[PDB]
Structures are given as structure tokens and as C-alpha cells.
Write a protein that binds this ligand. Sequence first.
Ligand SMILES: [Zn+2]
Ligand SMILES: [Zn+2]
Ligand SMILES: [Zn+2]
Ligand SMILES: [Zn+2]
Lengths: 152, 152
Amino acid sequence: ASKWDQKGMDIAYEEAALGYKEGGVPIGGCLINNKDGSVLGRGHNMRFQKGSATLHGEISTLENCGRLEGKVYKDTTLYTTLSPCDMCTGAIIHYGIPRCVVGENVNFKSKGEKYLQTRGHEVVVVDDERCKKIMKQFIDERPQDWFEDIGE
Amino acid sequence: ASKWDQKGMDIAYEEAALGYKEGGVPIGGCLINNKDGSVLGRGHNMRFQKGSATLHGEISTLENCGRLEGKVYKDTTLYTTLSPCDMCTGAIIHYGIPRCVVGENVNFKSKGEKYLQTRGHEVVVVDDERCKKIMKQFIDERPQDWFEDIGE
Ligand SMILES: [Zn+2]
Ligand SMILES: [Zn+2]
Ligand SMILES: [Zn+2]
Ligand SMILES: [Zn+2]
């Protein structure tokens, strides 16, 4: 089940780092087919890049996969550098993506992490230090922007 | 509490009808400030228009409101022509939008409708037959497209 998890989190981290370089929030993701390891799409938070309230890393990832038949999502893993908010949790549930692998849940965690599990989805938190470090750097440099991004 | 609800559902329906005319799925929305009735944004499903897997009517509506401080969402109502999926439910929860007014829940309903309420959001289903009729027309004419849109 975990065969592609290093590949997936490496891509998600690359997306976070790219977003950071663009002036955005360093949250990245990708969607991988569990059978063959192919990458259906990858993305990062586009709040700053696009003035976007909805393009979280996870949402941008799914957008970048394009229109798909519903069946395609059912044997994928969504990789995200940060534990998903209620909206991104809802996307995973809506599309029936069975597995979500999370870089870290230290800098952010919503009720969504547990809700995924109650709705029958697998959540794996890998506690990736690279993810924790880049996210903490953003929180330390741009706390007001982070507060906007979390929507409180 | 319901002062702006006719206005809001009228705008949501206009957005659904516009989307229908553009060749898309007839689901529309708007976000209104509860105090003064001002429209923060309005939108419709953009699957066909933009090849979008994530721009549901509710998501498009929120995107069209732009970047906002989190406090702005806390005294709004989101109007949608159709009862929200788990992703759109999650967006409402994430941003703390206290009220969701729904055109109809006959053509579609998710576990989100009830989840909204247990998470502390008011859900009002007005059973607007304009919404029900246009949505059913789309489902009747384009069942394959509908199936794709709901992620099944
Ligand atoms: Zn997130
Ligand atoms: Zn999110
Ligand atoms: Zn919907
Ligand atoms: Zn939706």
C-alpha cells in the first residue's frame, strides 16, 4: 500500500517549495494511481498567485488532474504536505479517493483528519521534517498571511 | 434571518440558468452579507466551461468573492440551487459561513446537508421548483455528463 508514498511526498514537497518561490503558501500535493505509480496531477496553494480563496494545495492538485471519470479516483492516493482542512477533506470524500498521505499535522490540523477516518478513508501521517520546516518558516515570516490562509 | 433569501436564491438561479445557456451544469450560487444584503460574489459550475473538476457552483461562488479576511465570512449566507456535496459542505464549514440556503435536495443530496447542521451551520431548503426543473432537465438530457459531474 505504501510503495509510492516516498515518490508522492517528494512531489508534494517539490510543489510546496515551488509555491514558496512564487511568493505563496508552501503547501503542495499530488494524486497518484496506486496500481502503477503514475502521477495524475500535482499542485500547490494558489492564494497569493491567483488571488484564490479555494485553490488550496489539495484542490489545485485535483484541478490539475482535469476532468476524469469518477472511477479513476477510486484507486488513488492524495499526497499533501499538510493535514487537510474541512474543504479538502470534503473533496477527498466526494471523489472517493481512498487514501490520503499527509506530510505533517503539527502546523495545522482540522476536524477533517478524523472525519476522513470515520467516513472510511485511510489517513497516513508521515511526519516529514522538510514539510514541517518550510511551513514553520512561512508561519514565522508571514503570520498575517497564514492567518488569512487558515480562514479564521 | 431570511430577509435576503429571495434575493439570494434569485441570483443563484440566474447563475444556474446562465451556466445552462453556456452549455454547463445548471448549478449556481451567491454569497450575501446578512447585515446589508450586499453580494460578495456569485458563480456557477464550470466543469464544461473550464474543464474544471473542482469549480462546483459553490466553489466558483467563493472563488469569485476573492481573498477575504476570515471574519468577513462569519456573517454571510451561501445560496446554492442544489444541496451541497461533501466538498462544498467542507468549504462552508472551513470558512465558517453560518447559513446555507438550498434551492432543492431532490435531484442531489449528500451526507453534507446533515453534517453542516451537526457542525453548527443553519441549512434552509426552500424547495424552489425553478431550480428543481432546470437541474432535472439537464439530468434527463445529459445523464453521462451528470454522472461525471457528481464524481460517480
Ligand atoms: Zn490545507
Ligand atoms: Zn484545504
Ligand atoms: Zn454541488
Ligand atoms: Zn460540491
